[PDB]
Amino acid sequence: GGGVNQILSLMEDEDAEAAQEEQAIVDVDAEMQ
Amino acid sequence: GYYTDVDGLPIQLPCKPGTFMPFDTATANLLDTGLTVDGTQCYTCQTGT
């Protein structure tokens, strides 16, 4: 277009995301065995 | 509608909200006349959209 001329529901969700990735990682490491 | 940034990409990624990738450069509606849509980079929507 031209450019220049020069909390309570966020951390509880990020912990759930960093636990659901953990679960996926654990389910993936157990399958290659 | 979609785009692909990196070389390897299984599926073409859609342009995120507040962006629009026109079909070709000439067949556009609102693009500043100092740029060309090569696909790989999605241009931000212009004021009043």
PDB file of C-alpha atoms in Angstrom:
ATOM      1  CA  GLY A   1       0.000   0.000   0.000  1.00  0.00           C
ATOM      2  CA  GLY A   2       3.175   2.200   0.089  1.00  0.00           C
ATOM      3  CA  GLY A   3       4.897   1.193   3.350  1.00  0.00           C
ATOM      4  CA  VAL A   4       7.254   3.471   5.277  1.00  0.00           C
ATOM      5  CA  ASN A   5       9.573   5.924   3.552  1.00  0.00           C
ATOM      6  CA  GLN A   6      12.603   4.615   5.474  1.00  0.00           C
ATOM      7  CA  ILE A   7      -3.036 -14.192  31.500  1.00  0.00           C
ATOM      8  CA  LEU A   8      -5.209 -16.649  33.409  1.00  0.00           C
ATOM      9  CA  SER A   9      -6.366 -18.192  30.106  1.00  0.00           C
ATOM     10  CA  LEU A  10      -2.963 -17.938  28.382  1.00  0.00           C
ATOM     11  CA  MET A  11      -0.520 -19.737  30.688  1.00  0.00           C
ATOM     12  CA  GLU A  12      -3.014 -22.508  31.480  1.00  0.00           C
ATOM     13  CA  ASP A  13      -3.320 -22.997  27.716  1.00  0.00           C
ATOM     14  CA  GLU A  14       0.415 -22.829  27.008  1.00  0.00           C
ATOM     15  CA  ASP A  15       1.044 -25.447  29.695  1.00  0.00           C
ATOM     16  CA  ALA A  16      -1.626 -27.635  28.106  1.00  0.00           C
ATOM     17  CA  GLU A  17       0.105 -27.157  24.747  1.00  0.00           C
ATOM     18  CA  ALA A  18       3.531 -28.010  26.185  1.00  0.00           C
ATOM     19  CA  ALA A  19       1.956 -31.111  27.738  1.00  0.00           C
ATOM     20  CA  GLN A  20       0.098 -32.159  24.580  1.00  0.00           C
ATOM     21  CA  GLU A  21       3.321 -31.870  22.612  1.00  0.00           C
ATOM     22  CA  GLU A  22       4.967 -33.906  25.375  1.00  0.00           C
ATOM     23  CA  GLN A  23       2.308 -36.603  25.013  1.00  0.00           C
ATOM     24  CA  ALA A  24       2.807 -36.662  21.240  1.00  0.00           C
ATOM     25  CA  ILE A  25       6.578 -36.922  21.675  1.00  0.00           C
ATOM     26  CA  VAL A  26       6.137 -39.804  24.125  1.00  0.00           C
ATOM     27  CA  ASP A  27       3.730 -41.542  21.744  1.00  0.00           C
ATOM     28  CA  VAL A  28       6.247 -41.079  18.928  1.00  0.00           C
ATOM     29  CA  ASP A  29       9.306 -42.346  20.828  1.00  0.00           C
ATOM     30  CA  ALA A  30       7.441 -45.494  21.877  1.00  0.00           C
ATOM     31  CA  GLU A  31       6.511 -46.375  18.287  1.00  0.00           C
ATOM     32  CA  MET A  32      10.036 -46.592  16.852  1.00  0.00           C
ATOM     33  CA  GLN A  33      10.923 -49.159  19.545  1.00  0.00           C
TER      34      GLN A  33
ATOM     35  CA  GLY B   1      -5.431 -17.730  -1.928  1.00  0.00           C
ATOM     36  CA  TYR B   2      -2.421 -19.643  -0.652  1.00  0.00           C
ATOM     37  CA  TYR B   3       1.360 -19.256  -0.697  1.00  0.00           C
ATOM     38  CA  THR B   4       4.589 -21.162  -0.074  1.00  0.00           C
ATOM     39  CA  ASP B   5       7.526 -19.472   1.661  1.00  0.00           C
ATOM     40  CA  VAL B   6      10.274 -22.103   1.942  1.00  0.00           C
ATOM     41  CA  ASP B   7      11.376 -24.407  -0.874  1.00  0.00           C
ATOM     42  CA  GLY B   8      10.145 -27.694   0.559  1.00  0.00           C
ATOM     43  CA  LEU B   9       6.463 -27.529   1.417  1.00  0.00           C
ATOM     44  CA  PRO B  10       4.064 -30.499   1.324  1.00  0.00           C
ATOM     45  CA  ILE B  11       0.891 -28.400   1.117  1.00  0.00           C
ATOM     46  CA  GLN B  12       0.462 -24.791   0.049  1.00  0.00           C
ATOM     47  CA  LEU B  13      -0.141 -22.605   3.118  1.00  0.00           C
ATOM     48  CA  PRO B  14      -3.068 -20.153   3.255  1.00  0.00           C
ATOM     49  CA  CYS B  15      -2.518 -16.427   3.683  1.00  0.00           C
ATOM     50  CA  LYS B  16      -3.156 -15.416   7.301  1.00  0.00           C
ATOM     51  CA  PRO B  17      -5.909 -12.960   8.310  1.00  0.00           C
ATOM     52  CA  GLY B  18      -5.151  -9.404   7.279  1.00  0.00           C
ATOM     53  CA  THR B  19      -3.314 -10.459   4.117  1.00  0.00           C
ATOM     54  CA  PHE B  20      -4.238 -11.240   0.528  1.00  0.00           C
ATOM     55  CA  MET B  21      -2.291 -12.913  -2.268  1.00  0.00           C
ATOM     56  CA  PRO B  22      -3.677 -11.900  -5.687  1.00  0.00           C
ATOM     57  CA  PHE B  23      -3.776 -14.365  -8.562  1.00  0.00           C
ATOM     58  CA  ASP B  24      -1.185 -12.552 -10.715  1.00  0.00           C
ATOM     59  CA  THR B  25       0.569  -9.200 -10.474  1.00  0.00           C
ATOM     60  CA  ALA B  26      -1.545  -7.458 -13.101  1.00  0.00           C
ATOM     61  CA  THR B  27      -4.817  -9.143 -12.145  1.00  0.00           C
ATOM     62  CA  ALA B  28      -4.979  -7.406  -8.757  1.00  0.00           C
ATOM     63  CA  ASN B  29      -7.189  -4.799  -7.124  1.00  0.00           C
ATOM     64  CA  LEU B  30      -5.194  -2.818  -4.527  1.00  0.00           C
ATOM     65  CA  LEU B  31      -1.422  -3.125  -4.861  1.00  0.00           C
ATOM     66  CA  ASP B  32       1.076  -0.290  -4.590  1.00  0.00           C
ATOM     67  CA  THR B  33       2.866   0.057  -7.918  1.00  0.00           C
ATOM     68  CA  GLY B  34       6.313  -0.852  -6.620  1.00  0.00           C
ATOM     69  CA  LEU B  35       5.978  -4.580  -6.046  1.00  0.00           C
ATOM     70  CA  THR B  36       5.107  -7.855  -7.750  1.00  0.00           C
ATOM     71  CA  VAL B  37       3.442 -10.935  -6.264  1.00  0.00           C
ATOM     72  CA  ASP B  38       5.792 -13.861  -6.891  1.00  0.00           C
ATOM     73  CA  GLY B  39       3.721 -16.172  -4.709  1.00  0.00           C
ATOM     74  CA  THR B  40       6.221 -16.890  -1.965  1.00  0.00           C
ATOM     75  CA  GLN B  41       5.436 -13.792   0.134  1.00  0.00           C
ATOM     76  CA  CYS B  42       1.938 -12.628   1.066  1.00  0.00           C
ATOM     77  CA  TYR B  43       1.228  -8.895   0.842  1.00  0.00           C
ATOM     78  CA  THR B  44      -0.634  -7.133   3.644  1.00  0.00           C
ATOM     79  CA  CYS B  45      -4.107  -5.732   3.046  1.00  0.00           C
ATOM     80  CA  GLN B  46      -4.396  -2.034   2.236  1.00  0.00           C
ATOM     81  CA  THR B  47      -6.117   0.524   4.485  1.00  0.00           C
ATOM     82  CA  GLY B  48      -9.904   0.266   4.448  1.00  0.00           C
ATOM     83  CA  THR B  49     -10.216  -3.516   4.244  1.00  0.00           C
TER      84      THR B  49
END
